[PDB]
Amino acid sequence: HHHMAKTRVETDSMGEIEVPSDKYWGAQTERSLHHFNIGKDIMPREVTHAFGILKKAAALTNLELGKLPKDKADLIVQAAEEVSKGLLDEHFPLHVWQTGSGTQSNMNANEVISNRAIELAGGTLGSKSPIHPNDHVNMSQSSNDTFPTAMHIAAAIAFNEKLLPAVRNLRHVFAAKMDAFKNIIKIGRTHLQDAVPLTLGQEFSGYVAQLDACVHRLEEVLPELYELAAGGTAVGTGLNTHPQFAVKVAEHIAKITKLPFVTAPNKFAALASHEPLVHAHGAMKTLACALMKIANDIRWLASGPRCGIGELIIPENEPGSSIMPGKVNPTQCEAMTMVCAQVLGNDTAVGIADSQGNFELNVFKPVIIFNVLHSLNLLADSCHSFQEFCAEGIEPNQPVIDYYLHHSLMLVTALNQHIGYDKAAKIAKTAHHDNISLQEAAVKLGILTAEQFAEFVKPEKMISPE
Amino acid sequence: HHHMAKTRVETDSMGEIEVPSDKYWGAQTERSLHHFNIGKDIMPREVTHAFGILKKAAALTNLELGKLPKDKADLIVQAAEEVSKGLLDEHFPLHVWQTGSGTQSNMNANEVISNRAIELAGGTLGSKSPIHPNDHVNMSQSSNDTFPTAMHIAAAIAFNEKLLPAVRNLRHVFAAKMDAFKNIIKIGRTHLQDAVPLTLGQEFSGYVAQLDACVHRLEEVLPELYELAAGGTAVGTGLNTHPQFAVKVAEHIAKITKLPFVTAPNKFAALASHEPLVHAHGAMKTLACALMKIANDIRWLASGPRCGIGELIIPENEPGSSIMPGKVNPTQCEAMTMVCAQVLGNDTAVGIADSQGNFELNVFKPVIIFNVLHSLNLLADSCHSFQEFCAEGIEPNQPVIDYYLHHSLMLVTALNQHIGYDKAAKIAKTAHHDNISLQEAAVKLGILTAEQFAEFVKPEKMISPE
Amino acid sequence: HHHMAKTRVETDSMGEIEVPSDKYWGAQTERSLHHFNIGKDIMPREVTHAFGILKKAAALTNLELGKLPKDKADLIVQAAEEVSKGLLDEHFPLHVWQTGSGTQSNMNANEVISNRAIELAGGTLGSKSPIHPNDHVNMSQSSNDTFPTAMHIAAAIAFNEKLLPAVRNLRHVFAAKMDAFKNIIKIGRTHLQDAVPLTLGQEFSGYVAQLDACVHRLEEVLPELYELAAGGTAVGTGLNTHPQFAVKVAEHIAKITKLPFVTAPNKFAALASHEPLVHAHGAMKTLACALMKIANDIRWLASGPRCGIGELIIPENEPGSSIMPGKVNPTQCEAMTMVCAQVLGNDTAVGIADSQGNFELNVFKPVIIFNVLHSLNLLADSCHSFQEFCAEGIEPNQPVIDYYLHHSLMLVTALNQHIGYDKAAKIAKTAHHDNISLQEAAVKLGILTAEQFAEFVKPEKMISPE
Amino acid sequence: HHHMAKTRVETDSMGEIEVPSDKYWGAQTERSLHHFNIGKDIMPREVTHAFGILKKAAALTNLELGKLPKDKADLIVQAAEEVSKGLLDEHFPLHVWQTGSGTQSNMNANEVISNRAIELAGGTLGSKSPIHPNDHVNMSQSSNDTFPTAMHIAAAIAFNEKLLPAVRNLRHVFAAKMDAFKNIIKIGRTHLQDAVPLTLGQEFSGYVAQLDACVHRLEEVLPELYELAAGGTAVGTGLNTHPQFAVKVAEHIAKITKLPFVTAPNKFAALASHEPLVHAHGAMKTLACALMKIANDIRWLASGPRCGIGELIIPENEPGSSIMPGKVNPTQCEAMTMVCAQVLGNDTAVGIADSQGNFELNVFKPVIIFNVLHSLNLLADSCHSFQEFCAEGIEPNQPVIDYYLHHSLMLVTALNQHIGYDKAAKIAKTAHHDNISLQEAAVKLGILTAEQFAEFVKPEKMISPE
């Protein structure tokens, strides 16, 4: 192994290893990079930032418990704050496809925070003095209860700060369009066939209701994620931690994040299984199922400009051609529906990985959180992009909407109570056979005048019960 | 088409069709059987029974609204009660793989209830008099808002009466075993490797906590399922139903079932999408992920009798061989883990089908409810079978548990505070090299007497924090 | 346990058990029914029939090897032939969710064939004389190498006799429509937007090519399925079978079926894993992905009759209403697309189950073959139904096809070489702005006469390279 | 929008846009980055390199057809060679979650190759002179037939050069271990229970056979991938390309790659669907199912060091602790099994995306190739890492293997032919009851001497047929 850049010597129990001088990680992170260079997927930075939160909270807890000297605590807190702010993300090189407990990324956090703290103290990086990655930064913690804590911190923060606001904000654009479109009457479509009318606002209200329900399902995940594994140590018993550490470290994490993190009531389930994250992903899967449908309705309704449906007009954002006026490819719908297919696959992966726990520890932890955060960021980013570059600009093509409404055969049942089923069916059959409107067929057959037809067939009286 | 058995003539708008005389379905059910003979999967009987509930509630509602005469209402209610009790299930022959709105099974219910009601009145089956399948049994309803109502009734009743009790009951067997095993100390296993100890009760407490969380996730689905589509009619607007029908029919369904069914606040989402059923299935998927792990722990811990782990003993229920004493194949674990694999696949199918709605109607309704009820019955039945024939009979193999506890190298860290890390590591290395116990190595090296070892290494002091 | 019907006493190593007198199964099948009453799914009858084939072949082999007397062989062959013909399927009551090796269904076959053979000999059912279910019907076989042999026999026969012919036959209907439609020019659609033209025959040729490729992928599975596990006995070594049994029994199975069954070259992989069946299901998944798209194109192109696309007309098979002329719901497309969603979920289940083998035996065998045969029958049946009741009757709506072709803006690039890009773009922009055709805009602007437009814009010259 | 770095002005039909001066992409790539900033996933570099191959081949073809001047061809070829060698990968910033046709990445290739070619000619970047991204680099190509060509080139090259060699090489390490272990007799395990013996070589032969079959399934994909969409242009007809372009460009791609690329016989299926890539992913899924099982056998057999199975010893690669001798966590098995879970989820995503084609174009192309290449690289990299750091170092723990072999009860059936079933069963029952070996029980009961037992029970005579 070699590095073009200058290196320093670090040590672990396997001996010396050279580490790039401008990086803060240590011997074990460097050594592990050599053995787990699988794929391109770097551990998600939300997990790195959550490790910063955990290590800060641990230092404050160990200080309060009298275990960690104030001067060492202050240095660790300062470095862990930089980690949690994302300022040291280039020092976290490990891939997802690592130790299944995530211990390697826990040690990456310990080594980075130790070496940055050593630098803040004016010491020699790699010397483990005055801040030792295991003895100080990992004090009262274990190889097994740290990564699952980072998983739940990362997922809960991302739900609250990124995903739920993105879905709420898209819902309120659809609601604003719903209100704008509340008096536009359009033809229904069931089984893809022409059907009785509804307003464009009513149809958009379905999307609003779908998104409302998804918001609620995502919120219902959060209490499970607020429960933290920290304090279970190696197998769940808390052996070799302080009797107060589990509760106090969660108290500090709650204070740091202003979210109601608590210690997990059952540490054995918290280490041996990850159904809270299966549930988090399942709620995201329900959102992908709703978004697939909503995005598909928008692109089908806007299809054209002349040989599709064409009831809606969407904004064009990629360059067009002056020789192709009216043509708009629905590229935000395409990105969103591709995201939705990915989320349904990621949901399969998460459930498979969760099902594979053995005894005291599920060792599929990195792939579980990787898929949760991948789906979350894809969904949130696509909601935001689809909102800005498609949904906010949706407009009705009123002449097309109106054409379908008054040229469909489906309004004919408004005639039954006036002329009877037989005469109404005759009007519809003649309209269909002669390729004319219901009104034109009624006049042609001498059954109704045009004024009688307009009195009897009022679409605004066909969008609610009697 | 032909029937060995005597037939009667029925009619629909395509003409005459012969229907077996001893069956209550009518022309459209018979005719559809000829076009949708796909697979072997008959529509689940819970859906049939829910149609009975809906049609009874509809008749009572239409009677109260003055639309349906009392004599016709009474006959429909009587026949619909037989349907809801399962007494007419042989008259529902249609397969899952039918019209994607489920309208064919709605018409199966209308025809059966009409012909049975005609028989109760002493009339001629097939005559549609005095009870017409469309004009009376389907009064105020539509082809599109009836099957989704049956879906939610069936799923909510099955959750409440079958699945949730089965999971609760399995949880309490594991809790009773947890209590029985609370003082049995065993070796932990992490990454499949020997680890620090925990009690067998603590390990079973993890399973108890997993099942508790699953119960809660399944309960959280129910409010979505209690909302019913009935009253949305063809496209969600309620055109061609009574303005009070949606609310009153749900009131009657709630009274019949003693569950809090209500009309859906948004009929457009209720017809165009089925995320409540995606969510119902997702919660079942979390249960499958937990059960896979629990069942696998039980069969691995009981593996043997001599060359596996062997900490547990499970009951034998299939015949054994007197020449193979001690051997027990974990067949309830095998059936359960196969069920869990099926549920994870069914969850993929449900999300795909839900994602495929278009405009005013999702027309994947039968496959969605088919998978929900299939997974539900597999999970509930396997919980019950695994409980009765495996979990209730789990016993510890105390000599094997004890052997591992005192022959593992992992208890050596109890020595550090007395003799130091170096001497403790020397004891462990000698034990490993010489294939002897930690106590034997400590004595062999002259570092500890046996009495000193027993004083310093107390597994009962190694299962909690300091 | 009890039975309304008369019973006889049977015995196994757990004692006496009552078995219905009119059923041919024995003690172990009855006893197992009491422990594995999970779900409704009875082991697929193709597996039962394949057990008949295996047991006939085994009897002929054991006769040839001198192990089985001729009189006993003849009786077993006669009963096993009845099993393989489906004549005894009501005597196979066990569910899929059984012993994960499938040994319970192997014993169901042994007991049925033994008791039917005893009856043919005039003996006492349940006495195991003169035909013993284990000592004669299971002679030279094991509990573990029999069900996987039945799996491969069932799957290979079903591929050859049912699935592949169904797909080939649907392909040739689409090819016949392709030929009929080869001169009908229609507008292309890309991203759902209007695009340059192609013939309806060219578009159908895509479906033909998709089905051809699927046929090839399904055929490529077969050599893996022809390799049989029989002869591996308990763990793959062949301990306790005749050195010639594995090869000779496969020779007899090949002769019975007229398919090239052979003994598996590696019995350890044949018992410990089932990737041939994962591959069989994966090829079916590719067919589901193609059929979803083909069925969706057909229903979208036929959507209407007036407010959708409407380029195609499909046959109506469920009763319509004289007041709704022209309306045809695409119910065969709906059943097919629901089947396709199911197959994608079943594919997830099969891969999960296959991944879960341990050591010498994968004990997820029933769920693997259950999903393979479920997907196979759904796909084959839906192909046949969709062919008969939809594809064979597809017709073009030529006036609608022609309207789109000549009212799209996309043909304008045919003008560039005659009038230049600028004038062509001006024609398109005016057509779009004024809601008129390209020809009308060209005339309106004085750029072209109508005769010049017709000379320059020839759709029949726009469906191939220069 | 802004850039800290110096920028140049580029133009598209939407106007001016600033592009970083040190980047080779152009207006449309920059503008699209602003609209499709979804997730972190950059289009896989294999697709970028394949675009280099396509654009080189296109330039050579257009030169041969007389359409492209030699001086412009030479410049494009030079720049496209740099792209195909990976030398310009920092100039391809677009994400997977883009236009569903992949046209945006096609234009990224055109703009990079144009601007690099302009630089090679000494011109002004952004001027589109002397090399125009559309008029020259995209000459004879379309927005829709280019990305699918890159998909197939990338996948076929990656199969041949990376995935298949990685699987073959892992197979031959397992085969070398198989040969080394051919005389080591161990206890079988079925259903996780002790079973009759087999050699460790026989058990490893199962893994070898599984990998051989997977190699064959992966090879069988390749003929589908060698067929290329290039030449189908917008909808499959080849409108607006040269009649010889499709065949000649594939000829040039075959010459460049030394792989047998050919033009696709049906361009409509090639644009409208992607079952070749579903099949490619399905074959990778079969490999994930095999690897999950193989990796699990290795980690279970090596579990310990004292309270698991412990028949194998694996190398330790992460630092251990001198106080935990003998303990080795199976971290390569963990990374591999996590990869396998990911591949099963990715397979679900690929099938869903492929099923969603409409009319002339499937617009899920980026997510399909993203998952194919993600799964491929994870599988190939994990095979290589698992080979180097686990499989090559697998050793038997012969004392543990031997202990199980001679202390299992399963060898007792070797006694039946000498002492009868009854006496053999008595020996087994006494051994089990008294916790002693079969030999000790036989002696204790006075049934056999130790020498008689050793003569009658020879494990080397128990691993094959009579």
Side-chain angles (χ1 to χ4, degrees), chain D residues 112-133:
Chain D
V112 167
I113 288 169
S114 155
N115 272 328
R116 178 58 176 142
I118 289 162
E119 183 179 66
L120 291 169
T124 300
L125 277 70
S127 71
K128 309 194 185 73
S129 181
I131 306 291
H132 197 285

Side-chain angles (χ1 to χ4, degrees), chain A residues 189 203 205 210 217 224 237-238 266 268 273 275 285 289 293 297 347-348 351 354 357 359-360 463-465, chain B residues 189 203 205 210 217 224 237-238 266 273 275 285 289 293 297 347-348 351 354 357 359-360 463-465:
Chain A
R189 290 178 181 82
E203 181 175 66
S205 83
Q210 290 180 271
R217 300 183 193 104
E224 300 205 77
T237 57
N266 192 286
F268 306 96
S273 63
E275 285 86 69
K285 199 193 82 171
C289 294
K293 194 276 185 185
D297 274 12
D347 193 80
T348 293
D354 185 63
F359 312 124
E360 279 55 76
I463 52 173
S464 69
Chain B
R189 290 178 181 82
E203 181 175 66
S205 83
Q210 290 180 271
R217 300 183 193 104
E224 300 205 77
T237 57
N266 192 286
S273 63
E275 285 86 69
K285 199 193 82 171
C289 294
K293 194 276 185 185
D297 274 12
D347 193 80
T348 293
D354 185 63
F359 312 124
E360 279 55 76
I463 52 173
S464 69

